[PDB]
Design a protein around this ligand. Structure first.
Ligand SMILES: [Zn+2]
Length: 32
């Protein structure tokens, strides 16, 4: 029962299953 992805901050999933729509890299999340 993992939530707010421990890699980004715009999803509630896990790294392997993570894809943050912020930039063209991996986790360009501006808040974190
Ligand atoms: Zn994520």
């Amino acid at each position: 029962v993992p939530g707010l992805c421990p890699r980004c901050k715009r999803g509630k999933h896990w790294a392997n299953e993570c894809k943050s729509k912020t930039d063209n890299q991996g986790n360009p999340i501006p808040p974190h």
